[PDB]
Amino acid sequence: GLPVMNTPGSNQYLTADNFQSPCALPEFDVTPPIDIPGEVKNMMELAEIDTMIPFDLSATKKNTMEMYRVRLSDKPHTDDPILCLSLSPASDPRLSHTMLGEILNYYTHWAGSLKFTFLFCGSMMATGKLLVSYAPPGADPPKKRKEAMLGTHVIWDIGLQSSCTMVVPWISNTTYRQTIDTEGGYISVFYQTRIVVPLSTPREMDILGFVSACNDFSVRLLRDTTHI
């Protein structure tokens, strides 16, 4: 017959191998598929979905409905931020649990832009200004409203538009970051003006926060760390 020469790698089973294989049911007429709504062709389609950030992971707030709400109140006008969110989507406990983070935990490398979307859930009457800042990687996060204003920022008007979609850029020395450890930036929200309200309307509102990958986002080198 055809003289062959069995090479190294013969009779080994590599779990990453991709060969043909004999069908155990070769005469069996498979149930044909139907057009179900919602076919996912890629996992990033699930990371491109605005999911809600848990900001308060304290002992009480966590694992409830309150861990997501950031409460704006009326107290002494301290320059410190309402929230400061580090942009370690995998190595930040807050973004780690989002859908994005759940998909990033399955991978080693990632690259792309994130879009954060804060959402005022207060009154139609209430008015005011927040300042949504973005410190780039390497920078030590802004501690006062002035430091934040001078850098990149968006003066969000609570009175006019009820959301604010700031998009982070892709800044990294490598073509890809890691999902574990080291910076990546900081979103941070300050009061520009203490929130005004009309009559006996409550002076304690809430802002929600969403995150999602952008169309430029990509991951690689699958790494499942799931076990018991």
Binding site: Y13, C23, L25, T31, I36, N42, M43, M99, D216
Partner: protein
């Protein structure tokens, strides 16, 4: 930019062990009903595949099963045994499962069977999509789980003097995957 490794095929089609089926040699000393091993194909045991599939509601996939058999003598005794053969029988859905070592199911024409000779390349088959429904339902909000089949395993040699235990690792690789209707992924908590 490239989103190939985050495609459903790349994310899912990865050889993952799903069970370790242990069978003893038909030794005539005191052997129990451990002479054969049976395991209903189910992803609800391995957390990796399950947690990846429960990202999504429905599904369809061929199922490439590889079988890595590894035996060893049990007793320190001067053990000797000719090369064992293993019958690895796939039982389709809705079919009867073996109860005894010498049940009739091991002679049924329906049930496809592999005859793996020990010390050779790992055995393999490719189960197709065996669903009555047009998609495997991972979550079903109704009243009366999905049947993929059963894998039964035995040693074919019968009157053996020395006991020989053997473990059959089953490396399931879903192939040609499609998934619909994503969902939030479960925590690792209840697994």
């Amino acid at each position: 930019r490239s989103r190939s490794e985050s495609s459903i095929e790349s994310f899912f089609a990865r050889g993952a062990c799903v069970t370790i089926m242990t069978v003893d040699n038909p030794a005539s000393t005191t052997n129990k009903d451990k002479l054969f091993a049976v395991w209903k194909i189910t992803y609800k045991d391995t957390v990796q595949l399950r947690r990846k599939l429960e990202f999504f509601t429905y599904s369809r996939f061929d199922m490439e099963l590889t079988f890595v058999v590894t035996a060893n003598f049990t007793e320190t005794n001067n053990g000797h045994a000719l090369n064992q053969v293993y019958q690895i029988m796939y039982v389709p859905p809705g079919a009867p499962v073996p109860e005894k070592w010498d049940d009739y199911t091991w002679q049924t024409s329906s049930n496809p069977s592999i005859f793996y000779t020990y010390g050779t390349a790992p055995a393999r088959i490719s189960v197709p999509y065996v669903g009555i429904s047009n998609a495997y339902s991972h979550f079903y909000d109704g009243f009366s789980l999905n049947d993929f089949g059963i894998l039964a395993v035995r040693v074919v040699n019968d009157h053996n003097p020395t006991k020989v235990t053997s473990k059959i690792r089953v490396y399931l690789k879903p192939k040609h995957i499609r998934v619909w209707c994503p969902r939030p992924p479960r925590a690792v908590a209840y697994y």
